[PDB]
Design an enzyme around this catalytic site. Structure first.
Site: not given
Length: 179
Positions: A64-67, A50, A135, A44-45
């Site tokens: 983090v949980g969401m971008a 990272r 992604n 994913q993005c």
């Protein structure tokens, strides 16, 4: 044509690999690591962003949980000694111009449903920026191309506004390592 999950599509500056993340058609096999350091979920993005900072800058931002949450982070961790470095957010339309290596954050919405999105700005031009990300593009990149998309940049009255290639999305802004 999109390539199978995990296919090498090309490279971002510094030789950072970009992989297809087409899951269509909990396991630890989907966890990305670089020498005991967790990078993210394949592919994913957030994982790409990272890994990029890790391989080219020796730093990472927290898991983090969401971008879209990245836009709220305020520090980067130097992986070699766990030293903390200041990170500041700059809303789209800010007089603080984007720079190569900066994190570009999207809020949730449109193409980026409830996750938002994150990409790395790789090049600066007078009327556009080149970015690298995972992604979004799942097809192999042209030979020699080390970016996935180019975004129009409008420079007016001392401000910089980036326009996305998608029409239903929302760009939050870019992050830069500074106080």
């Amino acid at each position: 044509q999109d390539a199978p999950f995990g296919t090498l599509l090309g490279y971002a500056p510094g030789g950072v690999a970009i992989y297809s993340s087409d899951y269509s058609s909990d396991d630890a096999v989907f966890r990305s690591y670089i020498d005991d350091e967790y990078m993210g979920h394949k592919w994913q993005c957030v994982e790409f962003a990272r890994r990029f900072l890790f391989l080219n800058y020796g730093v990472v931002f927290t898991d983090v949980g969401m971008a879209w949450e990245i836009f709220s982070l305020r520090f980067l961790r130097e992986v070699v000694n766990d030293n903390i470095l200041p990170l500041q957010a700059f809303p789209n339309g800010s007089p603080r111009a984007p720079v190569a290596g900066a994190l570009l954050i999207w809020d949730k919405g449109g193409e980026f449903k409830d996750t938002g999105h994150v990409a790395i700005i790789t090049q600066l031009h007078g009327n556009k920026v080149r970015i690298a990300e995972q992604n979004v593009i799942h097809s192999p990149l042209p030979q020699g191309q080390q970016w996935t998309r180019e975004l129009e940049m409008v420079v007016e009255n001392g401000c910089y506004t980036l326009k996305d290639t998608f029409d239903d999305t929302t760009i939050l802004g870019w992050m830069i390592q500074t106080e």
